[PDB]
Amino acid sequence: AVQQNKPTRSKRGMRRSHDALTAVTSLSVDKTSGEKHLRHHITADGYYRGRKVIAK
Amino acid sequence: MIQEQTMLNVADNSGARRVMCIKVLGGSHRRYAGVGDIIKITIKEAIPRGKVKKGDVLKAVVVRTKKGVRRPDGSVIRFDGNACVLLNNNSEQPIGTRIFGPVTRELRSEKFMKIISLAPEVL
Amino acid sequence: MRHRKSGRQLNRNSSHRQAMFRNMAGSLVRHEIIKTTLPKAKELRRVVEPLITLAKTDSVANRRLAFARTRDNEIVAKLFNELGPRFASRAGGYTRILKCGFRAGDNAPMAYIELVDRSEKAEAA
Amino acid sequence: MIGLVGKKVGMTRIFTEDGVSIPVTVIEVEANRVTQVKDLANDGYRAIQVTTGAKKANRVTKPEAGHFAKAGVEAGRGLWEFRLAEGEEFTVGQSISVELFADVKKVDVTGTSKGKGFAGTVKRWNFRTQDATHGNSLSHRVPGSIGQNQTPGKVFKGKKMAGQMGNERVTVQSLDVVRVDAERNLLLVKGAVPGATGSDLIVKPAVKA
Amino acid sequence: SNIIKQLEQEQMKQDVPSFRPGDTVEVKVWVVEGSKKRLQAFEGVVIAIRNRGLHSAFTVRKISNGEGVERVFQTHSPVVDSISVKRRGAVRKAKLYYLRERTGKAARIKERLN
RNA sequence: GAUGUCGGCUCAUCACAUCCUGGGGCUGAAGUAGGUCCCAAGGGUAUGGCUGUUCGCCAUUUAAAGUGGUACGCGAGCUGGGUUUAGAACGUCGUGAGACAGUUCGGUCCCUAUCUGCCGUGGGCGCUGGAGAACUGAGGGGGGCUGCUCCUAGUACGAGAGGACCGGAGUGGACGCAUCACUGGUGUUCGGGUUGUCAUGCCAAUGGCACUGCCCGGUAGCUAAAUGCGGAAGAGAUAAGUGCUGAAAGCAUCUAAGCACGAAACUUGCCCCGAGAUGAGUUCUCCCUGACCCUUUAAGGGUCCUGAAGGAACGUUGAAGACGACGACGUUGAUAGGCCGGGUGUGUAAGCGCAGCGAUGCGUUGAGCUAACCGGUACUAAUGAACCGUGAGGCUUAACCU
RNA sequence: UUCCUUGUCGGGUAAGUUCCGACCUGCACGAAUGGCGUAAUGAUGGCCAGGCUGUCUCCACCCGAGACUCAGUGAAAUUG
RNA sequence: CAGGUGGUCAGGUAGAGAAUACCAAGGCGCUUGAGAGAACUCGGGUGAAGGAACUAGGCAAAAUGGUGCCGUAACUUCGG
RNA sequence: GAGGACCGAACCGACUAAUGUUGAAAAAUUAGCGGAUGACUUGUGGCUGGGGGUGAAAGGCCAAUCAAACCGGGAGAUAG
Ligand SMILES: [Mg+2]
Ligand SMILES: [Mg+2]
Ligand SMILES: [Mg+2]
Ligand SMILES: [Mg+2]
Ligand SMILES: [Mg+2]
Ligand SMILES: [Mg+2]
Ligand SMILES: [Mg+2]
Ligand SMILES: [Mg+2]
Ligand SMILES: [Mg+2]
Ligand SMILES: [Mg+2]
Ligand SMILES: [Mg+2]
Ligand SMILES: [Mg+2]
Ligand SMILES: [Mg+2]
Ligand SMILES: [Mg+2]
Ligand SMILES: [Mg+2]
Ligand SMILES: [Mg+2]
Ligand SMILES: [Mg+2]
Ligand SMILES: [Mg+2]
Ligand SMILES: [Mg+2]
Ligand SMILES: [Mg+2]
Ligand SMILES: [Mg+2]
Ligand SMILES: [Mg+2]
Ligand SMILES: [Mg+2]
Ligand SMILES: [Mg+2]
Ligand SMILES: [Mg+2]
Ligand SMILES: [Mg+2]
Ligand SMILES: [Mg+2]
Ligand SMILES: [Mg+2]
Ligand SMILES: [Mg+2]
Ligand SMILES: [Mg+2]
Ligand SMILES: [Mg+2]
Ligand SMILES: [Mg+2]
Ligand SMILES: [Mg+2]
Ligand SMILES: [Mg+2]
Ligand SMILES: [Mg+2]
Ligand SMILES: [Mg+2]
Ligand SMILES: [Mg+2]
Ligand SMILES: [Mg+2]
Ligand SMILES: [Mg+2]
Ligand SMILES: [Mg+2]
Ligand SMILES: [Mg+2]
Ligand SMILES: [Mg+2]
Ligand SMILES: [Mg+2]
Ligand SMILES: [Mg+2]
Ligand SMILES: [Mg+2]
């Protein structure tokens, strides 16, 4: 099975109307280090909910 | 749970030993026959000098099944083999004069009272 | 359908899952904190925490039964000599899953899982 | 007659003293509280709106809370309407108990059947499986033909195909009422009713005989 | 749940004797033939027991008139009038389904001798 | 510059010149059972033996085993027996190469679906302030089969044999829906037995591998063979048909005026979907009551302040699920895991003691272990926030109030 | 090898256009382009029976690999 | 690049064996992963009752399976 | 201790089915299958050349090529 006519650039754009990425709504701010992080994820320096959970 | 091509033992003394169900009577596209159902059979093996001979086409009533019967309280009564009793092709009366092995009370009907009265044990 | 069923398949056969969680449980009690994918971490709880509950009653029967689940005497020793007494008063929930970033190689959701009492005094041994 | 909203507790059996096992479905029917009465003047049809169960105050929204406060009843886990037959009168805030079915012999139970997800044509429409052997190539449980040649040149609407099965409203009719236990908010009907354990059920007297 | 188990415990018999797979029991059931109701005995080996509270059951096997018969009883049904253990068997398994393939001397069961 | 060609399988759909069931007229229609014609397409409408077969014959059923259309429906769905390449052979024809709807044995069936269509399921925007619910029902779909026994009654009818209409009751077959209490299946996540071998230092005890090594059982879930329920009654308008009154046509006449009956068809009644029904409906509840500037001065633009109801997101998840969606829950917490207790399953662990030359047996012991189950329990993980959504909601007219 | 032809009769099956036995009416067998037999042999053709079974009645569940979602890479036939 | 490619070497336990299973010496985990646990396809496991009713056809599957001893028919070219 | 003897690995082959059919592969994989001391199989080297070779014979094979190979030339053959 294969196309009988070349689909247009218009049809191609309509199909991709749902391919748009959804940016992260908002980052959480740690209460101790004040860093930004994904909610429910530890920070880049190992903080989570105001606690140094990993020492690296 | 008897269907066509099923081989059954004979529970009477009519002379047949092995019969094969060739039709489940009583309804279009009917699939199975339980205890108390009439079936059309052919005789695959008989004793040398019985009342019936190999090749005859008769009717039979199923009296024992491996699938078993279900009682109103949920009980089951299963048997080790399938067995039937040969009936006259048009009169629906038992051909033999004796019944071997137990039967169930599903046969408790005026149509098969002859079988119930002859059975060694009714379950 | 999957109604009321539990346990993840993790794209492995049964014998591979059993071997993997046996190794992963041994690594968890040896280092007290490891980093793995979030699905593997959640299933590891149903493996390691029953071992800690088992290690609360020291006996040759429990030790052998723990050895059958781990196949490592160094692991069994630490379970009954260290982790048993350390969790004697805690009623379940000996682990803690902390979600972290995504693995660079395949964008897998990673997570740390650690024993809850991995405090500043764990540096003694 | 109006019906009641209950919850499917599960299935068990009742042994009758004469030796008969009756498979029953236990339906927990707590007090149904009338929250709104509709009439021909204001709404164009006669019906009552009931609620049942309880709900945590932190999970009810202000629009819903104001609706329950208007009636003066505690917030339940949902709202259901029942068309009133001619002669039935109910007041808002009035509570309706399971003893309404004291003399009812047969009921119709409505629920949401269990969801099977995406189901093939064999499971969903009882299609016949093609041959498992005898040369069959990758076509064991496929539906086979779905139409005729060029003359229709299309697939007819309503063709039986694979798709979502279950998880829909289903009514079982004419179920015998085995027992009405008013003091325990229980209703035992003979047979099986749609839905999983814990789902909401709507029990009405049998519209047929 | 608390609701269903409450409905079941008020239907269960309180005097069902204890028996194990391998014991030969004599079960007496109620047979109704119209206006009469007599007790029919059914003695055989217990080859399976299903423990489910009210839904408990056990299946008894016997050789009757050369035909092997198995009957599954609902132990809390009012049909089952009484249950009596005749002798106690000594088996290693919980389901004696292998007895279906044996007969005569091959289907013998050692007495528990407790 | 290719429209794959028989039959079968799967899946159908329409026609009515109807096979069954329904309604009738006539009968050389006593009854039963038929014959024939009219109306009627709602539903239903065999399994096998032989053959590539369609067909047909035969066996045995059934209320009946309808006739046709649909590319002799259906190969980007299956099959490849037949037909229809290359091999070979027989009969036959030909000097021969070869040939024969003559026969015989053998003989590669490709395609990841763009569009239409169809089955499901979402996103967007709309519906005129926003939001959360509950509905109305325009419209659409599903469903509609039937046997046998009993009573009426051995009555009506009939010389007898035989044997009813109408009406009522029970119980089946086929089909459909739902469910898992029961009976079972499965149950490579539970327990046990056991062969070979390797390892844990060795014994003992375990683990790995051998299709889950082979097996025996089996929880939850799923499920049929399991067990509940369904087809209706009723109503409206009718078909063929039967009529009442009744002229045209002093009679007669079912019809012309008028009136009454009349079928599984039609419209309802039953079940499901359903306000994108743009003709975008109804009801209930909830939320928002700040400034200021510019300009071409309007359904205008901008700044500051403000951010509600609610939503979404994230997290724990679900008998919900391809993904979305849908449901529950997020410390004022039982959402998941763990833990505790129980249940269930398996069947008397390990260790020790005793007996035995030993294999092994006995006692401790219905022991030990026990997945998805039940009841509990904040031990672990579900965070303070942030984000989206605003600030009283056009014009005209009419009835009401000012 | 036989068109007529599913010849006829017998056997087997409840039922056998195939099979086996016979008949001879050989459309159009026939004697080294061999005739008729033939033990053994055959991944040879036809037919029957026992055993066995998900081949089927009629499918159910389960274990894996894909399908599906996420990240990376990234084709093809076809096309006024 | 699941293909093809001559010769040599030949450990242990079980085994008739260079079969097969598990291992030694030695060498590898096959150059995308991570989730999910739909239809459907592929490769497998199990299956109530029935047991070829499937089908052109028992296709496929299931089944049989070793050693020793006992015992073994028609027919035969006397070997089978 | 004979055998174009028997069973069965290597080895040679290719009967059935499924898969694959823009393949892992321009002929394979998986499970079964035949021969397996011989008219056996295999390595290295050699010989036979296109109306010719070779052929336990299929018009088979002769470099993925065969009812007359391939390459260059006649050659811009001819084409109602
Ligand atoms: Mg993967
Ligand atoms: Mg579901
Ligand atoms: Mg079929
Ligand atoms: Mg193919
Ligand atoms: Mg058109
Ligand atoms: Mg063209
Ligand atoms: Mg048709
Ligand atoms: Mg007509
Ligand atoms: Mg109708
Ligand atoms: Mg056609
Ligand atoms: Mg086509
Ligand atoms: Mg062919
Ligand atoms: Mg030829
Ligand atoms: Mg194809
Ligand atoms: Mg198009
Ligand atoms: Mg189960
Ligand atoms: Mg040892
Ligand atoms: Mg190893
Ligand atoms: Mg293994
Ligand atoms: Mg427990
Ligand atoms: Mg046959
Ligand atoms: Mg045949
Ligand atoms: Mg012949
Ligand atoms: Mg000749
Ligand atoms: Mg010759
Ligand atoms: Mg032969
Ligand atoms: Mg991708
Ligand atoms: Mg080689
Ligand atoms: Mg090897
Ligand atoms: Mg799968
Ligand atoms: Mg089976
Ligand atoms: Mg069986
Ligand atoms: Mg058999
Ligand atoms: Mg057949
Ligand atoms: Mg057939
Ligand atoms: Mg085969
Ligand atoms: Mg096999
Ligand atoms: Mg040889
Ligand atoms: Mg050999
Ligand atoms: Mg091979
Ligand atoms: Mg040989
Ligand atoms: Mg030729
Ligand atoms: Mg070549
Ligand atoms: Mg020239
Ligand atoms: Mg030219």
Swiss-Prot record, chain A:
Subunit and interaction comment: Part of the 50S ribosomal subunit. Contacts L17.
Keywords for the protein's UniProt record, in alphabetical order: Ribonucleoprotein, Ribosomal protein
SUPFAM superfamilies: Zn-binding ribosomal proteins (SSF57829)
Molecular function GO terms recorded: structural constituent of ribosome
Keyword check for rRNA processing: no
Claim: Ligase is one of the keywords in the record: no
Matching PANTHER family: 50S RIBOSOMAL PROTEIN L32 (PTHR35534), LARGE RIBOSOMAL SUBUNIT PROTEIN BL32 (PTHR35534:SF1)
Family of this protein: Belongs to the bacterial ribosomal protein bL32 family.
GO cellular component: cytoplasm; cytosol; cytosolic large ribosomal subunit
Region (Disordered) location: 1-37
Pfam families registered for this protein in UniProt: Ribosomal_L32p
Name the record gives this protein: Large ribosomal subunit protein bL32
Native source species: Escherichia coli (strain K12)
GO biological process terms, semicolon-separated: cytoplasmic translation; response to radiation; response to reactive oxygen species; ribosomal large subunit assembly
Swiss-Prot record, chain B:
InterPro entries cross-referenced by the UniProt entry: Ribosomal_uL14, Ribosomal_uL14_bac-type, Ribosomal_uL14_CS, Ribosomal_uL14_sf
Pfam families linked to this entry: Ribosomal_L14
Protein task: Binds to 23S rRNA. Forms part of two intersubunit bridges in the 70S ribosome. In the 3.5 A resolved structures L14 and L19 interact and together make contact with the 16S rRNA in bridges B5 and B8.
Entry GO CC: cytoplasm; cytosol; cytosolic large ribosomal subunit
Summary of subunit composition and partner proteins: Part of the 50S ribosomal subunit. Forms a cluster with proteins L3 and L19. Forms two bridges to the 30S subunit in the 70S ribosome, contacting the 16S rRNA. In pre-50S ribosomal subunits interacts with RsfS, which may inhibit association with the 30S subunit.
Keyword Thylakoid applies: no
HAMAP family assigned: Ribosomal_uL14
Membrane in keyword set: no
Organism: Escherichia coli (strain K12)
Effect noted on mutating residue 114 to A: Reduced RsfS binding
GO BP, one annotated term: cytoplasmic translation
Alphabetically ordered keywords of this record: Ribonucleoprotein, Ribosomal protein, RNA-binding, rRNA-binding
UniProt record similarity statement: Belongs to the universal ribosomal protein uL14 family.
Name by which UniProt lists this protein: Large ribosomal subunit protein uL14
Superkingdom of source: Bacteria
Curated annotation (Swiss-Prot), chain C:
Gene Ontology biological process terms from the UniProt entry: cytoplasmic translation; ribosomal large subunit assembly
Pfam families the record matches: Ribosomal_L17
Gene3D superfamilies, per database record: Ribosomal protein L17 (3.90.1030.10)
Family to which the UniProt record says this protein belongs: Belongs to the bacterial ribosomal protein bL17 family.
Subunit structure of this chain's protein: Part of the 50S ribosomal subunit. Contacts protein L32.
Function: Requires L15 for assembly into the 50S subunit.
Listed name of the protein: Large ribosomal subunit protein bL17
From Swiss-Prot, chain E:
Keyword Ribosomal protein on entry: yes
Record's keyword terms, sorted: Ribonucleoprotein, Ribosomal protein, RNA-binding, rRNA-binding
Stimuli inducing this protein: Part of the rpsP-rimM-trmD-rplS operon.
Signal peptide boundaries: none
InterPro entries, per the entry: Ribosomal_bL19, Ribosomal_bL19_CS, Ribosomal_bL19_sf, Translation_prot_SH3-like_sf
One family name in Pfam for this protein: Ribosomal_L19
A GO molecular-function annotation: structural constituent of ribosome
Cellular component terms (Gene Ontology): cytoplasm; cytosol; cytosolic large ribosomal subunit
Any single biological process term in GO: cytoplasmic translation
Role: This protein is located at the 30S-50S ribosomal subunit interface and may play a role in the structure and function of the aminoacyl-tRNA binding site.
Similarity remark: Belongs to the bacterial ribosomal protein bL19 family.
NCBIfam families from the UniProt entry: rplS_bact
Summary of subunit composition and partner proteins: Part of the 50S ribosomal subunit. Contacts L14. Forms two bridges to the 30S subunit in the 70S ribosome, contacting the 16S rRNA. In pre-50S ribosomal subunits interacts with RsfS, which may inhibit association with the 30S subunit.
Protein name: Large ribosomal subunit protein bL19
Source taxonomy: Bacteria, Pseudomonadati, Pseudomonadota, Gammaproteobacteria, Enterobacterales
Gene coding for it: rplS
